[PDB]
Amino acid sequence: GPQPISRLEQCGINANDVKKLEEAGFHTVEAVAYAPKKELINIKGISEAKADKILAEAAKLVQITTGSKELDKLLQGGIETGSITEMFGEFRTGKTQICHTLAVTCQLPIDRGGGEGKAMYIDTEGTFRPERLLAVAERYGLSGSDVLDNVAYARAFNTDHQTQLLYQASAMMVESRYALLIVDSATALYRTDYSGRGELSARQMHLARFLRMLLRLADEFGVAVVITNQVVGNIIAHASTTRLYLRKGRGETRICKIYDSPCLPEAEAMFAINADGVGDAKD
DNA sequence: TGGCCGTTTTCGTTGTTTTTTTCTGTCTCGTGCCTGGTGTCTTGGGTGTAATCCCCTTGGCGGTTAAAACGCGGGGGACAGCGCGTACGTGCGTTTAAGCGGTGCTAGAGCTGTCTACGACCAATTGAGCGGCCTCGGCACCGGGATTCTGAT
């Protein structure tokens, strides 16, 4: 399991540097331990000696239904909890709609295709609609009020705030059972904030660390990690376990394709976006 | 398809290198000679060697503290790019004097002879300078106040 980074402070790292590591997004001794010097050195106010002391002392201690049956079959029954699933597609393909649907379906009983856990929606694009969550809840006969009470929401204004919310998510996810973490327009802040060309490596490093934190949180809490990508990077490939390509069919009916999964076939399924739901295509 | 730029080549030229031919003076060999280098014998003093001593260099112990090492923020200086203008490179017509060859001449370089002033050397002398001892004041260090100076405002 995890080894929360608090224990690293008893090794004699000072607590301020541990706070800087938590701000960076390292929350376990496992997390600090299996990384090279440069990760800790790149943090502001950390020299090579402090990074070597951290690594040295760290080595001492150490299926959610989509609600579309065709899509569930495409996924062999739904998202695997504990792993990151990326859905990349054009704008208006229904990524946000799928997120809203899953934010409620996660709360469904496991026998009903849920995870019996609360949902987490981190929004960067303003598209969060509690009324859509209410619609999905009424679709499955779930209490809309309890759905909104079991979904904690916060809009990230920048990449630093986007990573900082993970610090609150890790501590908050310990007290209550969650099953779904949603990050909508996850890549948008890396394009709007970091727009220059010399700063590309900085946003790539921040994204890499963010993805590693996502995988860490997935393995730590056994929750589903959902991130949304606008396709107007090869780094996500090794990190994402299931890549879904979304494209528009005219009207409100969307085509979904699987474009990489080591376990799931590359395959396609047709679905629609209905007021209640993300739901099977009904010609 | 039109334009622009990179390139390649090609032709002109021209300055540099290479090949050939005449000469010449500069270099290689021969000769005669004489003086500087070699053999011999001599002395003596300079250098090699041996014993001794002591002083002064090396090594160690300990402390302690000033300086070295290290981290970090930042600012200012190194450096790259760009535009311009002017000073400098190139070429050409003119001229000036550098160079070469001849002729003249005389100051002074160079050699020789002579000799006298002067310096090596030596003995006796003695007083200046050196080794050693002692002391006091210029300077250095401490401390404290005054003044100056720098940078942010």
XYZ file of N, CA and C (backbone and C1' of nucleotides) in Angstrom, chain A residues 45-47, chain B residues 71-73:
30
model
N 13.901 26.143 -3.601
C 14.426 26.069 -2.252
C 14.889 24.695 -1.826
N 15.398 23.890 -2.758
C 15.921 22.563 -2.451
C 17.241 22.390 -3.186
N 18.305 22.116 -2.436
C 19.629 21.908 -2.995
C 19.860 20.419 -3.242
P 26.758 23.456 -1.005
O 25.433 24.276 -0.662
C 25.447 25.198 0.416
C 24.107 25.892 0.546
C 23.298 25.947 -0.728
O 21.925 26.160 -0.423
C 24.275 28.059 -0.283
P 20.832 26.229 -1.597
O 20.566 27.793 -1.791
C 20.368 28.628 -0.662
C 20.191 30.071 -1.091
C 19.594 30.264 -2.482
O 18.711 31.374 -2.470
C 21.670 31.315 -2.392
P 17.509 31.444 -3.527
O 17.079 32.980 -3.545
C 17.364 33.824 -2.442
C 17.885 35.151 -2.938
C 17.294 35.614 -4.259
O 17.030 37.000 -4.191
C 19.640 35.454 -4.448
